[PDB]
Amino acid sequence: AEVTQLSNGIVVATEHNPSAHTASVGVVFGSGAANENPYNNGVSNLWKNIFLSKENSAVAAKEGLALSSNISRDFQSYIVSSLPGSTDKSLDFLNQSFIQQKANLLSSSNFEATKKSVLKQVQDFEENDHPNRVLEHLHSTAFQNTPLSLPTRGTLESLENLVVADLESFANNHFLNSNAVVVGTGNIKHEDLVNSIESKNLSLQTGTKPVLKKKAAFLGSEVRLRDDTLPKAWISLAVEGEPVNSPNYFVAKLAAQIFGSYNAFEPASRLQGIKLLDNIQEYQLCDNFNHFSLSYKDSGLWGFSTATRNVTMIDDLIHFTLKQWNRLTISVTDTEVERAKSLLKLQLGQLYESGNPVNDANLLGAEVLIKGSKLSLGEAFKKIDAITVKDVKAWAGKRLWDQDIAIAGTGQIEGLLDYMRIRSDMSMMRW
Amino acid sequence: GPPSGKTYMGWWGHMGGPKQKGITSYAVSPYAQKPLQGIFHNAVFNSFRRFKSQFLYVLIPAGIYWYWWKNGNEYNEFLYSKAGREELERVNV
CATH class of the missing domain: 3.30.830.10 (Metalloenzyme, LuxS/M16 peptidase-like)
Structure with missing residues (x-):
């Protein structure tokens, strides 16, 4: 290997x-x-x-x-x-x-x-x-x-x-x-x-590809694509994240794994150790969500996506989710970190050890083009087991606490409130 | 409680307008733009434009009522002078 x-x-x-x-x-x-x-x-x-x-x-x-x-x-x-x-x-x-x-x-x-x-x-x-x-x-x-x-x-x-x-x-x-x-x-x-x-x-050709004039930059903004004839609302929301070849690459992946993914219609997915689920299930504000941490050569994104049929309680869904994010700066526990450690290892252990050689080739070629070398899976595990609560709180205090956001939505999104009432939920006031 | 007689207004999600399709909205954060940006090109462009439109509806009435108060106040002071005592005893009867 x-x-x-x-x-x-x-x-x-x-x-x-x-x-x-x-x-x-x-x-x-x-x-x-x-x-x-x-x-x-x-x-x-x-x-x-x-x-x-x-x-x-x-x-x-x-x-x-x-x-x-x-x-x-x-x-x-x-x-x-x-x-x-x-x-x-x-x-x-x-x-x-x-x-x-x-x-x-x-x-x-x-x-x-x-x-x-x-x-x-x-x-x-x-x-x-x-x-x-x-x-x-x-x-x-x-x-x-x-x-x-x-x-x-x-x-x-x-x-x-x-x-x-x-x-x-x-x-x-x-x-x-x-x-x-x-x-x-x-x-x-x-x-x-x-x-x-x-x-x-x-040999294909020699070289000298063009250099790209502009560098990637994040801007807080929103775009709304309203369609009242569709039966649901689809929304995604994120902040600026980490690029490839960053020191905080695995810490941002662990933080996304803390809140995880959900399907309302699967019985075992309702029993996960995620404190956000104690808030949504009593009135059932969504059908599914998933948290992502995407990384590129120049920048990244960190956030979540959701779909729901409860179009009169969208403001409660966005509110409760953003308040849980605040806890990463203040009050994240040790149990929530030890859970996300071992589930992150299972996640990327299945991505890098599937049976399809086509997926292997795409992963290998993309990593060697940036780093000149591939980091083995035994090395990535050791970096993940060395993360502490202090590293998470330091990352979240810099990337999440009172930072600008990007939002996109389509469907029945009348109940999605304005930008500045969502932006205000990125800090607490009660700290 | 029971539901009462309904309105021409609802709430978030069921506000009660027509169905919309094909409209897209864009916006930028206020933290990412510079406030107090053009407020001249505002008080000299738009206020003067807004004034120039709605000023003949306010000033032609004002000119009729002020002229009326004038000619009355002028005539009263004449009545109670000594040169207008003959007219006073004519109109006061």
């Missing part, structure tokens, strides 16, 4: 697992939706779908190869999967169809067919997926006029004016050897992957 990195001008990372039955090989780039502008937003989402189109997936299926891809704000992925004794064929396909030749993929017929499907994907998302479009709107009001505001799928208006030239320009600027990591997970040995690469030569 250890990763091995080498460099030849090309970075090559690998987590070998001898007891698996598959192998994944791919390339991860260090540019995401936070590396484009409002005019070409969605060009990366359209690159993913050109990779996964028919005539490229057909050519892989005849050889016994499956394909995958993912767009995020800091990185992109293009992965190939196979049986363990078929990994050299995986690398060849990744060489031919992607890095060297792509005139086959950017044809006039394949481009229009791909654009039609992607527009239908995005239009469907904006009309039916309410919890996820409110979290995207939160990012856009918190980081307005800054690169961390742009949605990852793109916007239906900017996505309509794209041509092949926009794709080719974006490729020449960001798909570069200086901005790339080659990964390998599952039943694959490091030496074999290194040997297969030097037998070929395998």
Whole structure:
């Protein structure tokens, strides 16, 4: 259980697992939706779908190869999967169809067919997926006029004016050897992957990606998208949090785990050791909530999201939740900290030790692109067990107590009160 | 208690207006903006604009009633002078 990195001008990372039955090989780039502008937003989402189109997936299926891809704000992925004794064929396909030749993929017929499907994907998302479009709107009001505001799928208006030239320009600027990591997970040995690469030569482009003029900045604000015909209210609320490669990275994750997640219709979720639940269940002000701590290269967010059918008691839900947050500065106990320690270990122990090599490749490539190295799971546990009550109170006194907030909501949100009555609940007065 | 006869107003969540769809609202925190920002370009732009509109509805009435008080007060002082004693004994009868 250890990763091995080498460099030849090309970075090559690998987590070998001898007891698996598959192998994944791919390339991860260090540019995401936070590396484009409002005019070409969605060009990366359209690159993913050109990779996964028919005539490229057909050519892989005849050889016994499956394909995958993912767009995020800091990185992109293009992965190939196979049986363990078929990994050299995986690398060849990744060489031919992607890095060297792509005139086959950017044809006039394949481009229009791909654009039609992607527009239908995005239009469907904006009309039916309410919890996820409110979290995207939160990012856009918190980081307005800054690169961390742009949605990852793109916007239906900017996505309509794209041509092949926009794709080719974006490729020449960001798909570069200086901005790339080659990964390998599952039943694959490091030496074999290194040997297969030097037998070929395998370089995409040289480097010099553009530098981004503006840095990300948090701004307290709100955006309300009112729709009285929907049957619920969906709300998300956050403060500024921690970026990746921060000293307070695990302390913010432990603090989110203290308040946790809830489903009203599951019996065992009603019995969790969370003091907020003693307040909501007597009048049943929500159906579910979840606390998050999101982290990027430049900034982060810390907060919660909720959905509810009780549209006359929204003000009681927001009030009781924000008063529990205040206790992290004043009166958090030792039992609440020892519970969140061991449940945080179970959480990220399941994220980093699933059975899917595709998830391993995305995690590994994103971490090595920032830190140059991966922190093992035995090391992360020791940092978590060394946190005390004093560290939590010091973090909360700086990040939560009387600080500005960002809010987004949709649906039946008449009962959501104004900004300054919610902002005033971030301090107590009775300390 | 029992419910009484209902109103043309409700409360938060059921205020009693029409259903809304397709309106979006944006706002910025006051801590993130600078107060006392333009209050000239206010007393010289908007107050003078608001004055210029609603001043002929207040001053034409004021001019009619003040003229009336004048001509009466002028005439009274004449009646009780010595040059207006003949008129006084005419009008007071």
